[PDB]
mmCIF file of all heavy atoms in Angstrom:
data_model
loop_
_atom_site.group_PDB
_atom_site.id
_atom_site.type_symbol
_atom_site.label_atom_id
_atom_site.label_comp_id
_atom_site.label_asym_id
_atom_site.label_seq_id
_atom_site.Cartn_x
_atom_site.Cartn_y
_atom_site.Cartn_z
ATOM 1 N N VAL A 1 -143.437 216.535 -52.983
ATOM 2 C CA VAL A 1 -143.141 215.702 -54.169
ATOM 3 C C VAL A 1 -143.351 216.522 -55.439
ATOM 4 O O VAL A 1 -144.396 217.176 -55.586
ATOM 5 C CB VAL A 1 -144.020 214.449 -54.163
ATOM 6 C CG1 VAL A 1 -143.892 213.701 -55.496
ATOM 7 C CG2 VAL A 1 -143.614 213.528 -53.027
ATOM 8 N N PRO A 2 -142.402 216.508 -56.392
ATOM 9 C CA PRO A 2 -142.605 217.205 -57.669
ATOM 10 C C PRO A 2 -143.580 216.500 -58.609
ATOM 11 O O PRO A 2 -144.276 215.562 -58.229
ATOM 12 C CB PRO A 2 -141.192 217.231 -58.274
ATOM 13 C CG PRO A 2 -140.269 217.064 -57.120
ATOM 14 C CD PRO A 2 -140.991 216.121 -56.213
ATOM 15 N N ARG A 3 -143.607 216.974 -59.858
ATOM 16 C CA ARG A 3 -144.443 216.426 -60.937
ATOM 17 C C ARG A 3 -145.903 216.616 -60.548
ATOM 18 O O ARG A 3 -146.267 217.711 -60.084
ATOM 19 C CB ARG A 3 -144.012 214.990 -61.223
ATOM 20 C CG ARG A 3 -142.599 214.883 -61.770
ATOM 21 C CD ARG A 3 -142.183 213.445 -62.032
ATOM 22 N NE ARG A 3 -142.941 212.838 -63.123
ATOM 23 C CZ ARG A 3 -142.627 212.961 -64.413
ATOM 24 N NH1 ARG A 3 -141.565 213.673 -64.783
ATOM 25 N NH2 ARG A 3 -143.379 212.372 -65.338
ATOM 26 N N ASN A 4 -146.770 215.612 -60.697
ATOM 27 C CA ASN A 4 -148.204 215.791 -60.545
ATOM 28 C C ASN A 4 -148.811 214.687 -59.694
ATOM 29 O O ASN A 4 -148.482 213.509 -59.854
ATOM 30 C CB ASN A 4 -148.910 215.842 -61.905
ATOM 31 C CG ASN A 4 -148.702 214.566 -62.711
ATOM 32 O OD1 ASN A 4 -147.797 213.785 -62.433
ATOM 33 N ND2 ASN A 4 -149.549 214.347 -63.715
ATOM 34 N N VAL A 5 -149.715 215.084 -58.803
ATOM 35 C CA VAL A 5 -150.523 214.138 -58.034
ATOM 36 C C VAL A 5 -151.727 213.750 -58.875
ATOM 37 O O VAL A 5 -152.327 214.592 -59.551
ATOM 38 C CB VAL A 5 -150.943 214.758 -56.694
ATOM 39 C CG1 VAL A 5 -151.777 213.769 -55.876
ATOM 40 C CG2 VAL A 5 -149.726 215.233 -55.912
ATOM 41 N N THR A 6 -152.086 212.470 -58.846
ATOM 42 C CA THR A 6 -153.147 211.934 -59.685
ATOM 43 C C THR A 6 -154.071 211.043 -58.863
ATOM 44 O O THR A 6 -153.786 210.693 -57.715
ATOM 45 C CB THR A 6 -152.573 211.143 -60.872
ATOM 46 O OG1 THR A 6 -153.637 210.742 -61.747
ATOM 47 C CG2 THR A 6 -151.800 209.917 -60.388
ATOM 48 N N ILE A 7 -155.199 210.676 -59.476
ATOM 49 C CA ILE A 7 -156.216 209.870 -58.808
ATOM 50 C C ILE A 7 -156.054 208.431 -59.299
ATOM 51 O O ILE A 7 -155.155 208.128 -60.083
ATOM 52 C CB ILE A 7 -157.626 210.442 -59.069
ATOM 53 C CG1 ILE A 7 -158.621 210.012 -57.982
ATOM 54 C CG2 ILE A 7 -158.137 210.042 -60.456
ATOM 55 C CD1 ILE A 7 -158.300 210.550 -56.600
ATOM 56 N N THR A 8 -156.936 207.538 -58.846
ATOM 57 C CA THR A 8 -156.740 206.102 -58.982
ATOM 58 C C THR A 8 -156.602 205.658 -60.436
ATOM 59 O O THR A 8 -157.455 205.963 -61.273
ATOM 60 C CB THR A 8 -157.908 205.359 -58.316
ATOM 61 O OG1 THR A 8 -157.924 205.652 -56.919
ATOM 62 C CG2 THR A 8 -157.782 203.851 -58.522
ATOM 63 N N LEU A 9 -155.537 204.913 -60.711
ATOM 64 C CA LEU A 9 -155.396 204.139 -61.935
ATOM 65 C C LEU A 9 -154.633 202.865 -61.565
ATOM 66 O O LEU A 9 -154.381 202.605 -60.381
ATOM 67 C CB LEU A 9 -154.721 204.974 -63.032
ATOM 68 C CG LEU A 9 -154.757 204.471 -64.484
ATOM 69 C CD1 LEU A 9 -156.186 204.499 -65.020
ATOM 70 C CD2 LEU A 9 -153.823 205.254 -65.389
ATOM 71 N N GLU A 10 -154.255 202.064 -62.571
ATOM 72 C CA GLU A 10 -153.677 200.741 -62.359
ATOM 73 C C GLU A 10 -154.437 200.026 -61.256
ATOM 74 O O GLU A 10 -153.917 199.802 -60.156
ATOM 75 C CB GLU A 10 -152.168 200.827 -62.083
ATOM 76 C CG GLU A 10 -151.714 201.643 -60.876
ATOM 77 C CD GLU A 10 -150.205 201.698 -60.769
ATOM 78 O OE1 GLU A 10 -149.528 200.843 -61.387
ATOM 79 O OE2 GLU A 10 -149.680 202.598 -60.076
ATOM 80 N N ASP A 11 -155.681 199.658 -61.561
ATOM 81 C CA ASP A 11 -156.602 199.166 -60.543
ATOM 82 C C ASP A 11 -156.073 197.903 -59.870
ATOM 83 O O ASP A 11 -155.915 197.857 -58.644
ATOM 84 C CB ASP A 11 -157.971 198.916 -61.178
ATOM 85 C CG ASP A 11 -159.042 198.587 -60.172
ATOM 86 O OD1 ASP A 11 -158.724 198.494 -58.963
ATOM 87 O OD2 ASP A 11 -160.220 198.430 -60.571
ATOM 88 N N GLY A 12 -155.791 196.868 -60.660
ATOM 89 C CA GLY A 12 -155.333 195.614 -60.114
ATOM 90 C C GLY A 12 -156.465 194.830 -59.462
ATOM 91 O O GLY A 12 -157.605 195.276 -59.360
ATOM 92 N N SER A 13 -156.114 193.619 -59.013
ATOM 93 C CA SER A 13 -157.095 192.754 -58.368
ATOM 94 C C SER A 13 -157.352 193.159 -56.917
ATOM 95 O O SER A 13 -158.463 192.965 -56.414
ATOM 96 C CB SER A 13 -156.629 191.302 -58.422
ATOM 97 O OG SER A 13 -155.434 191.122 -57.691
ATOM 98 N N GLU A 14 -156.344 193.712 -56.240
ATOM 99 C CA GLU A 14 -156.518 194.121 -54.847
ATOM 100 C C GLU A 14 -157.586 195.200 -54.731
ATOM 101 O O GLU A 14 -158.590 195.029 -54.028
ATOM 102 C CB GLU A 14 -155.180 194.618 -54.300
ATOM 103 C CG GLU A 14 -155.133 194.787 -52.783
ATOM 104 C CD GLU A 14 -155.087 193.453 -52.051
ATOM 105 O OE1 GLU A 14 -154.846 192.420 -52.712
ATOM 106 O OE2 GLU A 14 -155.278 193.443 -50.818
ATOM 107 N N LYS A 15 -157.392 196.321 -55.436
ATOM 108 C CA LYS A 15 -158.357 197.411 -55.485
ATOM 109 C C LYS A 15 -158.686 197.940 -54.088
ATOM 110 O O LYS A 15 -157.814 198.480 -53.403
ATOM 111 C CB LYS A 15 -159.625 196.977 -56.227
ATOM 112 C CG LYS A 15 -160.584 198.133 -56.523
ATOM 113 C CD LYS A 15 -161.798 197.701 -57.322
ATOM 114 C CE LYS A 15 -162.802 198.843 -57.426
ATOM 115 N NZ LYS A 15 -162.213 200.047 -58.082
ATOM 116 N N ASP A 16 -159.934 197.772 -53.658
ATOM 117 C CA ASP A 16 -160.510 198.529 -52.555
ATOM 118 C C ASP A 16 -160.293 197.882 -51.189
ATOM 119 O O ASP A 16 -160.867 198.345 -50.205
ATOM 120 C CB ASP A 16 -162.007 198.729 -52.797
ATOM 121 C CG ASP A 16 -162.292 199.774 -53.871
ATOM 122 O OD1 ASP A 16 -161.365 200.527 -54.237
ATOM 123 O OD2 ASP A 16 -163.446 199.846 -54.338
ATOM 124 N N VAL A 17 -159.501 196.814 -51.112
ATOM 125 C CA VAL A 17 -159.292 196.136 -49.840
ATOM 126 C C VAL A 17 -158.737 197.118 -48.812
ATOM 127 O O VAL A 17 -158.026 198.081 -49.144
ATOM 128 C CB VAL A 17 -158.368 194.920 -50.022
ATOM 129 C CG1 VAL A 17 -158.120 194.219 -48.685
ATOM 130 C CG2 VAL A 17 -158.961 193.950 -51.029
ATOM 131 N N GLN A 18 -159.058 196.867 -47.556
ATOM 132 C CA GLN A 18 -158.857 197.810 -46.453
ATOM 133 C C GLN A 18 -157.368 198.024 -46.175
ATOM 134 O O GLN A 18 -156.506 197.254 -46.626
ATOM 135 C CB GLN A 18 -159.568 197.300 -45.197
ATOM 136 C CG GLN A 18 -159.824 198.335 -44.115
ATOM 137 C CD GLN A 18 -160.578 197.751 -42.940
ATOM 138 O OE1 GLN A 18 -160.958 196.582 -42.950
ATOM 139 N NE2 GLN A 18 -160.811 198.569 -41.917
ATOM 140 N N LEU A 19 -157.068 199.089 -45.434
ATOM 141 C CA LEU A 19 -155.704 199.462 -45.025
ATOM 142 C C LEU A 19 -154.833 199.810 -46.239
ATOM 143 O O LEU A 19 -153.928 199.073 -46.636
ATOM 144 C CB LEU A 19 -155.037 198.339 -44.200
ATOM 145 C CG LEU A 19 -155.357 198.175 -42.716
ATOM 146 C CD1 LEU A 19 -155.219 199.499 -41.964
ATOM 147 C CD2 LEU A 19 -156.736 197.604 -42.493
ATOM 148 N N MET A 20 -155.143 200.968 -46.820
ATOM 149 C CA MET A 20 -154.341 201.557 -47.888
ATOM 150 C C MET A 20 -154.066 203.025 -47.583
ATOM 151 O O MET A 20 -154.965 203.748 -47.147
ATOM 152 C CB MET A 20 -155.042 201.453 -49.249
ATOM 153 C CG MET A 20 -154.286 202.138 -50.375
ATOM 154 S SD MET A 20 -155.023 201.873 -52.005
ATOM 155 C CE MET A 20 -154.007 202.965 -52.997
ATOM 156 N N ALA A 21 -152.826 203.454 -47.811
ATOM 157 C CA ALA A 21 -152.469 204.867 -47.763
ATOM 158 C C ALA A 21 -151.617 205.229 -48.977
ATOM 159 O O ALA A 21 -150.477 204.768 -49.087
ATOM 160 C CB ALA A 21 -151.731 205.201 -46.472
ATOM 161 N N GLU A 22 -152.166 206.041 -49.871
ATOM 162 C CA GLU A 22 -151.385 206.742 -50.879
ATOM 163 C C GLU A 22 -151.806 208.205 -50.942
ATOM 164 O O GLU A 22 -151.022 209.097 -50.611
ATOM 165 C CB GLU A 22 -151.498 206.089 -52.261
ATOM 166 C CG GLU A 22 -150.745 204.781 -52.396
ATOM 167 C CD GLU A 22 -150.831 204.198 -53.793
ATOM 168 O OE1 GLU A 22 -151.654 204.682 -54.592
ATOM 169 O OE2 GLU A 22 -150.065 203.257 -54.099
ATOM 170 N N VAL A 23 -153.033 208.440 -51.387
ATOM 171 C CA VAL A 23 -153.589 209.791 -51.477
ATOM 172 C C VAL A 23 -154.622 209.920 -50.363
ATOM 173 O O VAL A 23 -155.701 209.325 -50.427
ATOM 174 C CB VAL A 23 -154.218 210.053 -52.849
ATOM 175 C CG1 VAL A 23 -154.829 211.449 -52.898
ATOM 176 C CG2 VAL A 23 -153.178 209.882 -53.950
ATOM 177 N N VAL A 24 -154.295 210.710 -49.335
ATOM 178 C CA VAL A 24 -155.160 210.926 -48.183
ATOM 179 C C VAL A 24 -154.977 212.364 -47.720
ATOM 180 O O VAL A 24 -153.859 212.894 -47.736
ATOM 181 C CB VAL A 24 -154.853 209.948 -47.035
ATOM 182 C CG1 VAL A 24 -155.719 210.259 -45.817
ATOM 183 C CG2 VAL A 24 -155.058 208.498 -47.486
ATOM 184 N N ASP A 25 -156.070 212.995 -47.314
ATOM 185 C CA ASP A 25 -156.056 214.372 -46.833
ATOM 186 C C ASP A 25 -156.573 214.393 -45.393
ATOM 187 O O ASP A 25 -157.761 214.153 -45.154
ATOM 188 C CB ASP A 25 -156.910 215.270 -47.726
ATOM 189 C CG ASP A 25 -156.336 215.420 -49.115
ATOM 190 O OD1 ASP A 25 -155.136 215.114 -49.308
ATOM 191 O OD2 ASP A 25 -157.085 215.833 -50.029
#
């Protein structure tokens, strides 16, 4: 993917609820 990888923003109400994949190593 071009441009830049970034860390968490646009928190929202869902936030930390289980079963999420965006940035994972």
Side-chain angles (χ1 to χ4, degrees):
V1 171
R3 295 179 67 85
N4 59 342
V5 181
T6 185
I7 203 65
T8 297
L9 193 67
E10 59 183 341
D11 188 357
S13 64
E14 193 73 13
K15 189 177 172 59
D16 286 346
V17 179
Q18 198 178 357
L19 280 310
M20 176 174 173
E22 286 183 349
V23 178
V24 176
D25 293 343

